[PDB]
């Protein structure tokens, strides 16, 4: 009974958009110690770093 005909569907999906953000406070003191450690040498206390 020749009546059949396969069908193919074509759905497309959108991507949407999300994000996550947070704050991370640096104390003047922590970035303080930071500044010397980038140039760590005989100076700049190691226990401090």
């Amino acid at each position: 009974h020749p009546v059949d005909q396969p069908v193919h569907n074509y759905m497309v999906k959108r991507i949407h958009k999300r994000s996550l953000s947070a704050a991370f406070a640096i104390a003047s003191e922590a970035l303080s110690l930071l500044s010397n450690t980038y140039v760590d040498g005989t100076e700049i206390d190691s226990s401090l770093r």
Partner: protein
Amino acid sequence: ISLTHQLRTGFHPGIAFTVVRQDRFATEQLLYAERASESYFVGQIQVHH
């Protein structure tokens, strides 16, 4: 009106008075801040605006 009667023309009450002001003198300083009592503890330069 009658007591500075006896206080503004020539006649005179069973009270009286006593001058002052609040005048001007002074002092100053020059110490001997010492060999073994007085201080600090040596160091730093660090920043925040």
